[PDB]
């Protein structure tokens, strides 16, 4: 092919950015044109395509956030949005498509396909729930937001001993409380993949609690429930002084970490060979530290499943 | 004298321990032993005093909390409480006392002269919000973590187009709010200190929408009402997507900034500069960019006030 | 006037964008046009000026660096060179400048009075060695890149019971040295405006150390001398592994400190001020806390000095 | 077994205290006592060792360096040596070893199983060559710290439109600068796995400047040669004002990023498992994704490579 097309969608994630640079520089590498759609799914309808050169993509790699933007877009839904939609890649001459974004994103570019339109996504969510990959691009960065507030968190607890309910995002997934609660010495991890008994929790807490440990750190993924509910019935139960922190949004900014850098390079690469060689309707990721490709139908099929020993790990090392 | 404590009182503060670390290190270089105070006043009553060797401060100077604990002591309101608490200081024999913390902190300092027992007070919050100091220590911590947050909120925000309110802590002071709206690029800062108009505030927002503008931050010190009344209230009258955050504690922890370092250094000397020299009934602090001291008893009629200019500044840069 | 210039000279510094930014503003709610001189005085000459509209500020305020870019014009200091860029000025209609820089360029402010060009000087140095002012744009941020070096080393320094000689910037002035070092818990402060004794410093670390003190941090202004030259002077002298580390030009770049921010937004706003009220040849600062402005040719008589009982406290703590 | 004992040689690395305390609680959960070996094989043979209780190894998590502290023991090479220390560990009643840290120290723990002490090493270096893990621990941080430091040298950079050369730690390894200069936008990466030509370095430099590149950012591993003569000779060849960076020490201090938390935590504890099941002379890691464990041995002969396909990634990015 000579012309391609590269959207972000679905939430932003730190990391977008270098995707977008290596799909464009990649793709230019290669003699192959670069345009961007604004927007996501949206902008695609409503045509905003600009061509990206070689220098657009200069001075973003540190960046936060998507310079293509990222809207939701539900008359893709329907047959009429994508006609629409796929009437403007041909009124730009665009034929691929790199999709950076979430599972709602690679079901997009997967009808995409279906109409003839080769599409790749990219996996760009900061929740680690995308299945092909073990790691998505902006989960990296995310983690190191949330122990970076931890270990604040652990300084005001230390100072008052006190009990602090962290709540954390990750909608349906456990990822980011899991590998956080245990990088911050948390005491309980409540996840939603993993069944907990409240009572249990409580006695665990209590005998730290004798055992002398000033402070105690208490991490919830929103997809469990909420920071207040738990606050509220750990407080009741133990007597302690507890406060919760709802992290939030500052979880989705920042500068990308080295990783979710490299990582976003190498995949938004990658993700161009394969609309060159022909490939389509294909996902990218990284599996057991290696560059892999699933077919989206496939791939969407299977499930987002965590490292269940490293949760036992997390109530092993909080005695 | 030969012999002083020390103690941290009120919410904790980043820049606590380089505060008790000059205490340390200047009573010493002067021959004079340093006794340390655990739990604050709750723990002056109980009799929670060690001695503080040169050593036991090494490796404290970056570090956020107090490694003295703090803890809240209604029972030092009293006569009786003020006793044994003197009691408890004749018994180990001490004779000054530094006290780091809040304005509650300063008047148990005060009751304590009055008994008898030269005090210093030194000022620890992340409010900014007492007498007698431009800055107190923590504050430059506070305002560097509350940008941290912006900046992070701006890249998701512009990302999505979208409206932030981030609510900020100073109960009753707007520092924190004013300083960070004003370097972070806010739309909008609303403090105590300052009366708004929430229809010209809309008027405002709406405004820079027009003009082009991606995101919206709004900066809401606890101080003036909720986070999420203001998102309620500013989403209903602009249709625009909102999002609320609540920064809350990571506010209270880290590691101290290289001001706040210096600053907490500074002070704590002088507190001790000033017992030696048998001024008690103090508070230290940095006025006009000069060390200073005050009588407690005066620094606390004294009100605190902000730049109104600072925040006229804040309107103009916001178009 | 109706029309002004803004331009960037000397070493770049953290700070700088958010000056740009309230000069650009602040003009424009007063009505007035602002150009953008790029490359300071070199394209002033060169006549690289281009119209600075509301947003081209937009998105800057948290970045490094100088977005006009900056540039070393030994072309300036010729008459001619005044004349050409004096031209330039006219040749555009602009009216007024803004000069954001060092005291090289505050010279060059200074020579356009002179010929009729009502300019005013902003402190833009990570030196903070500008008369008229206590702290320059950018220092508050160098500050802070060099503590977060000094912990690094303090970290790998405890685990191998080392001494480390590390050299900051401030090729005249000892600031950058003197408040790291005291931030920094350092045990020697070498800086230029006070003296040492290299047997007395010698005499002090040795004493530490056998005090039990694990490592050992060593701050040396490149002002003073090399780091290297110290670092072989003190290994030979005390016969402890010894490390030099030369922090170099980081401590020029970085997402400027919330103090950077807020004192960089002052200054800008102010120095627009003044052109409109027809004051010129003056040159902006904070003394003794308040926004304070003197006539350039008389701040640059004054000199640059430090607290020197700051530097004592630096010896006293180190115990 | 009952008592294990636990160690770290080598260079620190950020991490080292995170893997400590998986040891530590790991051990305890099991009901076995761990015991602190003091600065390394050093104190090994001066009998340096304390019994480590659950707490002593809280608030270490987020710290850099080693709290059991680091040294090199020439003395250990020797039978005598290896005769003294296995003494110790008798005299001790400690019956394994847990040995955190590099190649160098891998030997060691050879020697001691060789002589009967069952021995199991974690991979503690921040240079990522160790062979029979994909990451040792400490690398990710070093990472972040260099891009920290490539982001705020690319703002002074910009600035004044310079070229800079950065040198990073990786004695004989290219990691460090591969992944940095990835994650780093840069220009040009000299490792010591692949072969350059100074030639074509050049012509790609030129190529990029005069197609309107601002700043150069080129990353020389000190395994290479020094950043001095790349500097020099870069210069001379291309008449670009150059500057040299040497990171030095920084790249070994700071607070573990996530990654290297939960890494540490999960091999620190995988090494407690191994010797309690028996299993002795191995050294853990990552592979593929998974905990893999061999023969020190056998680990030892294989050697270290890198992505060779990253390396063009990185040619091709650079466009
Ligand atoms: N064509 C161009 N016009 C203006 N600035 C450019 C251009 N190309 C590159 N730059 C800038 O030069 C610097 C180095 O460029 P480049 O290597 O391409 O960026 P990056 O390392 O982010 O990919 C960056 O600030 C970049 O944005
Ligand atoms: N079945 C679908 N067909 C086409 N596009 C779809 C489909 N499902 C989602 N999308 C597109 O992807 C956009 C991003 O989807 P969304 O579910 O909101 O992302 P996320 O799941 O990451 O929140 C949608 O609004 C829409 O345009
Ligand atoms: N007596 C001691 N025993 C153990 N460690 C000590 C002792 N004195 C100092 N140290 C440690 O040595 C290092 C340097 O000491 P010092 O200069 O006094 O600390 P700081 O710079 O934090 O004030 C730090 O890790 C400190 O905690
Ligand atoms: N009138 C008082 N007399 C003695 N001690 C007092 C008085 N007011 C406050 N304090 C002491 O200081 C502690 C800290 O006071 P508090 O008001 O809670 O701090 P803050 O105002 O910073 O929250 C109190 O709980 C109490 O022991
Ligand atoms: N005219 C414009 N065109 C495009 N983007 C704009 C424009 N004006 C503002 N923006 C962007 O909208 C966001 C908020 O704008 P603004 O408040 O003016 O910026 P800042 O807070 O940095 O001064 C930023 O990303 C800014 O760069
Ligand atoms: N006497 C002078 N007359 C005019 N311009 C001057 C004079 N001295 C310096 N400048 C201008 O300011 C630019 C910045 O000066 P420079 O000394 O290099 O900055 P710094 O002192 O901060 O390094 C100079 O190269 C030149 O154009
Ligand atoms: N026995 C103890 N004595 C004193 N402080 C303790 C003790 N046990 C734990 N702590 C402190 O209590 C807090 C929480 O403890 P813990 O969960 O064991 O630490 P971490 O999360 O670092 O492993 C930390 O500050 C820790 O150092
Ligand atoms: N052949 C060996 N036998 C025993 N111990 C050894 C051997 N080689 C190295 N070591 C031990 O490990 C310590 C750490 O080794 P060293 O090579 O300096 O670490 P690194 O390679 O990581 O620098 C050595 O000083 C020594 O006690
Ligand atoms: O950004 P919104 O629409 O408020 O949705 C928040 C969701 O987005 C994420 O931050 C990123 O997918 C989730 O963790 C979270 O539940
Ligand atoms: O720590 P608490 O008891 O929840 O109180 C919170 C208060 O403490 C502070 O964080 C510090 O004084 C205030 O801004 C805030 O209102
Ligand atoms: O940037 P250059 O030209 O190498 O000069 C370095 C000088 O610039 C500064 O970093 C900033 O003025 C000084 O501390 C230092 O001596
Ligand atoms: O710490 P030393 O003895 O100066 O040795 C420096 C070496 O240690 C490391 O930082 C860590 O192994 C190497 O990259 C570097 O070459
Ligand atoms: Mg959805
Ligand atoms: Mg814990
Ligand atoms: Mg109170
Ligand atoms: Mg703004
Ligand atoms: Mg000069
Ligand atoms: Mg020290
Ligand atoms: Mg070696
Ligand atoms: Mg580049």
């Given at each position: 092919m000579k012309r391609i097309g590269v959207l972000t969608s679905g939430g932003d994630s730190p990391g977008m950015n270098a995707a977008i640079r290596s799909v464009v520089r990649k793709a230019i590498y290669h003699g192959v044109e670069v345009y961007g759609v604004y927007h996501g799914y949206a902008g695609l309808i409503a045509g905003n395509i600009k061509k990206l050169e070689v220098?657009?993509?200069?001075?973003?790699?540190?960046?936060?956030?998507?310079?293509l933007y990222t809207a939701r877009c539900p008359e893709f839904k329907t047959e009429e949005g994508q006609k629409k939609g796929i009437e403007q890649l041909k009124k730009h001459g665009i034929q691929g498509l790199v999709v950076i974004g979430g599972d709602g994103s690679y079901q997009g570019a997967k009808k995409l396909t279906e109409h003839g339109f080769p599409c790749v996504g990219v996996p760009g969510t900061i929740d680690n729930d995308i299945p092909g990959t073990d790691f998505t691009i902006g989960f990296d960065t995310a983690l190191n937001t949330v122990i970076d507030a931890i270990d604040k968190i652990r300084d005001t607890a230390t100072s008052h001993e006190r009990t602090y309910v962290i709540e954390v995002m990750g909608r349906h997934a456990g990822d980011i409380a899991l590998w956080s609660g245990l990088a911050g010495g948390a005491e309980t991890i409540l996840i939603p993949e993993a069944d907990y008994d409240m009572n249990d929790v409580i006695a665990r807490l209590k005998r730290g609690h004798e055992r002398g440990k000033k402070h105690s750190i208490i991490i919830v993924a929103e997809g469990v429930g909420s920071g207040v509910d738990f606050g509220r019935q750990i407080q009741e139960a133990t007597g302690f002084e507890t406060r919760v922190t709802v992290?939030?949004?500052?979880?989705?900014?920042?500068?990308?970490?080295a990783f979710d850098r490299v990582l976003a390079s190498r995949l938004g690469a990658r993700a161009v060979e394969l609309l060159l060689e022909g490939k389509g309707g294909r996902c990218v990721g990284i599996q057991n530290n290696q560059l892999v490709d699933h077919d989206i139908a496939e791939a969407l099929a299977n499930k987002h499943t965590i490292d269940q020993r490293m949760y036992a790990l997390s109530k092993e090392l909080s005695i």
């Amino acid at each position: 092919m000579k012309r391609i097309g590269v959207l972000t969608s679905g939430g932003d994630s730190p990391g977008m950015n270098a995707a977008i640079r290596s799909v464009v520089r990649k793709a230019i590498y290669h003699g192959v044109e670069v345009y961007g759609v604004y927007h996501g799914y949206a902008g695609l309808i409503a045509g905003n395509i600009k061509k990206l050169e070689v220098g657009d993509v200069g001075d973003i790699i540190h960046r936060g956030g998507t310079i293509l933007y990222t809207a939701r877009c539900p008359e893709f839904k329907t047959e009429e949005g994508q006609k629409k939609g796929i009437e403007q890649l041909k009124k730009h001459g665009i034929q691929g498509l790199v999709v950076i974004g979430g599972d709602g994103s690679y079901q997009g570019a997967k009808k995409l396909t279906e109409h003839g339109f080769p599409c790749v996504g990219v996996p760009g969510t900061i929740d680690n729930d995308i299945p092909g990959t073990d790691f998505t691009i902006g989960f990296d960065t995310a983690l190191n937001t949330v122990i970076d507030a931890i270990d604040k968190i652990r300084d005001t607890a230390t100072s008052h001993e006190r009990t602090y309910v962290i709540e954390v995002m990750g909608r349906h997934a456990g990822d980011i409380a899991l590998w956080s609660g245990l990088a911050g010495g948390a005491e309980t991890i409540l996840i939603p993949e993993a069944d907990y008994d409240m009572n249990d929790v409580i006695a665990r807490l209590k005998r730290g609690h004798e055992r002398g440990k000033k402070h105690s750190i208490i991490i919830v993924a929103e997809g469990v429930g909420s920071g207040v509910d738990f606050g509220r019935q750990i407080q009741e139960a133990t007597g302690f002084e507890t406060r919760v922190t709802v992290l939030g949004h500052v979880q989705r900014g920042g500068s990308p970490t080295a990783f979710d850098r490299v990582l976003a390079s190498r995949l938004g690469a990658r993700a161009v060979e394969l609309l060159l060689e022909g490939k389509g309707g294909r996902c990218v990721g990284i599996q057991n530290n290696q560059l892999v490709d699933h077919d989206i139908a496939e791939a969407l099929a299977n499930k987002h499943t965590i490292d269940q020993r490293m949760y036992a790990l997390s109530k092993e090392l909080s005695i």
